[PDB]
């Protein structure tokens, strides 16, 4: 039961790309984030 077979319904095509990073996952269990895009 604890399987979580997750199917991706995010995109149809995904190609020609530069970055790819993998780590331990980021995530009543409040979870807070701040995203910001400064100088690249």
């Amino acid at each position, epitope marked *: 039961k604890s399987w979580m*077979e997750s*199917e*991706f*319904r995010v995109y*149809s*095509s995904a190609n020609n790309c530069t970055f790819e990073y993998v780590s331990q996952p980021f995530l009543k269990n409040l979870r807070e984030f701040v995203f910001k895009n400064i100088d690249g």
Partner: antibody, heavy 124, light 105 residues
Framework: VQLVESGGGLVKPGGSLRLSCAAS????????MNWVRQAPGKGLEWVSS????????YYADSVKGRFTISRDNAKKSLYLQMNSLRVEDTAVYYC??????????????????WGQGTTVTVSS | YELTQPPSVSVSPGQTATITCSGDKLGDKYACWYQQRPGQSPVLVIYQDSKRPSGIPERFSGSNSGNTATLTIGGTQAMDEAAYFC?????????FGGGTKLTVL
């Protein structure tokens, strides 16, 4: 969606065909397609299957190296290249959607939308 | 992998039908069932061994355990006379059952 097939006709053994299964709506994009052939005297056989993206393609043991399933979500069409049509390939073929996006989720669904089948006959 | 279905079974109208499907460790897998009335494209009637698709009356009851998949039809009527294909997926391979024909008198 609403499915219509085409392409089945009279060919001799070893010949070439190219079936089709056209969709009405663009919801076709969200459906993993399956090809199922129905014998003139028996039930159904699974022929092939393709993912919603089209990158997860599988064939039955009796048909690999001969058939080539392909699709076009922008064209809302599903094809099936039909080469080395061989003695027991005479049947009626059904195009059936699964719903599961990838082969890992096919077991969680079933083939729900079938179009009108197309009759394929091989004989000398 | 093969799924074994009896060639045919029959019950009188208004009775309860029971059609079996056998496979190796088949109770660990998801099985779908379809109705093929003669001259007709099949229709899905049971999937995930317990759930019932939209548009199907509740008398189409299916269950799975061990090496047998079973479908139960209480209050069988005339148009339950159809070919019944037990389906299952194993290693990304669509394998269909034999197909049990149900006959109502």
């Amino acid at each position: 969606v609403q499915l219509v097939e085409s392409g089945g006709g009279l060919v001799k053994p070893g010949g070439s065909l190219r079936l089709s299964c056209a969709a009405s709506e663009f919801t076709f994009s969200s459906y993993s397609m399956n090809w199922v052939r129905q014998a003139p005297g028996k039930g159904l056989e699974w022929v092939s299957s393709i993912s919603s993206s089209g990158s997860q393609i599988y064939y039955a043991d009796s048909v690999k190296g001969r058939f080539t399933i392909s699709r076009d979500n922008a064209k809302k069409s599903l094809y099936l290249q039909m080469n080395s049509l061989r003695v027991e390939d005479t049947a009626v073929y059904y195009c059936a959607t699964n719903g599961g996006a990838h082969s890992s989720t096919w077991s969680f669904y079933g083939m729900d939308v079938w179009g009108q089948g197309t009759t394929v006959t091989v004989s000398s | 992998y093969e799924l074994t279905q009896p060639p045919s079974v029959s019950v009188s109208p208004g009775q309860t039908a029971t059609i079996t499907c056998s496979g190796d460790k088949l109770g660990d897998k998801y099985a779908c069932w379809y109705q093929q009335r003669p001259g007709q494209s099949p229709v899905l009637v049971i999937y995930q061994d317990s759930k019932r698709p939209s548009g199907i009356p509740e008398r189409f009851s299916g269950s799975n355990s061990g090496n047998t998949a079973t479908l139960t039809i209480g209050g069988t009527q005339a148009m339950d006379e159809a070919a019944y294909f037990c389906q299952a997926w194993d290693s990304n391979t669509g394998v269909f059952g034999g197909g049990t024909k149900l006959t109502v008198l």
